C-alpha cells in the first residue's frame, strides 16, 4: 500500500479539457507504475478554484473505472499558486517498494 | 487487505440535526453491508457541498462510538449545477473481502450518482 | 496501515507561521509514533479558509519528506468552528495496532 501523486494543467476552464487532461494523467500514472483498476484502492482529485466546469472523476468513469472509490475537492486556496491545476492522489495495492513509485507531473504542473 | 468504501447521501435542510443524522445512517449502512466494526476502519473522509455548513458530518461517527478513528472533513469540489445537499464519505478499511465484493452505498437523492 | 490525525493553530495568516507550526506538528506526530519517512504512505493537510498564506506541505519538504505523497485542501466551511487551524491526516505502514496510534493536538487545537 503506497500513494501516487499526479498533477497537470488545463488552458481553459472547460469540461472537455478538465476531463481530457485528467484522463491523460490517470492513464500515465497507471502505465508508469504498471497498474490496472483492481490495484487501485482510492483516487482523490483536487482542482484550483479557477476550475469549475466538471468533476475530474468523469475521466475515471470514461476509462471504465467504475469499481473504485473516488472523491473530488478543491485545492487549498493559496493566492499566487499554480493556476488551472488538477491534482491526483491515488492509493494502490502494489508489489513495488515506495522508492520505486513514479509520480507524474504534466503540462504546467512540471514546476510542481 | 486495504480497500476503500464510498458513500453518498442527501439531506432536506442545512441543519445540524439533518447533517448528523443522515451521515449516521449512511455510516451505519456502510458498516452493515460490509460487516465492519470500528476495529476495521483506517480512516473516514467527509465532504459536503457548499450549501451545507451547519455542522461537521464527523460528529455522526462520534455519536455511534467511533471515537478511535481518524476523521477529516472538507467541502466537495465546487461545480455549479451538481447534486446539492450532498454528504459524501470515503472510508479506508482493513478487510478480507475482494474489491469487487465491497459495497458502496448511495442513499436518498445520492442514488442518482 | 493505520491513519494518524494532527491539529494545531497559528497566531497569524503568514507563510512563516503556517510552515513552522505545521512542521512542529508533523515532527511530533512522527516522534510520538516512531515513524521515519519510509513508514509514511500519504499526508493530507487542511487549513481553515482564513489561512491562505502558504501550502502546509512545505513543512513536510523541510523535514526531508520529499518522497511522500502530499495533498492540501481547505477544511470544511463550518461557521462556529476553530479558525487559524491546520489539520493533518497521515496514513502509515506500521506494526503498531490501531489503539497504540498517538494523535497530536497542539496550541489552540487542544480544544478539539
Amino acid at each position: 500500500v503506497w500513494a501516487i501523486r499526479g498533477a497537470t494543467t488545463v488552458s481553459d476552464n472547460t469540461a472537455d479539457e478538465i476531463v481530457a487532461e485528467t484522463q491523460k494523467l490517470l492513464k500515465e500514472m497507471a502505465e508508469k507504475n504498471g497498474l490496472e483498476e483492481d490495484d487501485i484502492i482510492s483516487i482523490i482529485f483536487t482542482v484550483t478554484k479557477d476550475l469549475d466546469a466538471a468533476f475530474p472523476a468523469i475521466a475515471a468513469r470514461n476509462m471504465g473505472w467504475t469499481s473504485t472509490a473516488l472523491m473530488c475537492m478543491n485545492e487549498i486556496d493559496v493566492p499566487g499558486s499554480l493556476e488551472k491545476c488538477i491534482r491526483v492522489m491515488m492509493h494502490v495495492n502494489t508489489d513495488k517498494d515506495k522508492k520505486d513509485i513514479k509520480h507524474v507531473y504534466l503540462n504546467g504542473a512540471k514546476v510542481l
Side-chain angles (χ1 to χ4, degrees), chain A:
Chain A
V1 181
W2 299 117
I4 313 175
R5 274 298 321 285
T8 194
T9 53
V10 292
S11 297
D12 301 297
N13 180 26
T14 53
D16 287 13
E17 204 157 345
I18 288 167
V19 173
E21 297 309 314
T22 304
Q23 198 158 335
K24 292 193 273 201
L25 179 59
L26 292 174
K27 282 174 77 68
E28 178 138 21
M29 287 168 78
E31 288 176 43
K32 279 173 73 175
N33 291 277
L35 299 170
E36 305 173 8
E37 194 200 353
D38 59 38
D39 300 316
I40 298 173
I41 297 169
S42 52
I43 320 181
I44 294 161
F45 303 91
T46 61
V47 304
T48 45
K49 298 275 200 69
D50 56 0
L51 304 183
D52 74 344
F55 276 63
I58 295 169
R61 186 180 70 172
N62 282 354
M63 293 162 75
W65 292 4
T66 53
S67 309
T68 308
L70 309 178
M71 190 120 289
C72 297
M73 300 83 142
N74 282 104
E75 185 68 8
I76 190 177
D77 184 1
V78 178
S81 63
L82 184 56
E83 297 181 324
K84 301 186 184 75
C85 180
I86 303 165
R87 297 180 170 80
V88 178
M89 179 183 265
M90 196 188 270
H91 286 74
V92 303
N93 284 312
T94 183
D95 52 70
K96 290 166 60 178
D97 303 308
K98 192 186 167 175
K99 306 298 288 183
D100 302 322
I101 295 302
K102 307 209 194 174
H103 308 270
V104 179
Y105 288 90
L106 303 174
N107 297 347
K110 296 197 87 70
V111 302
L112 302 174

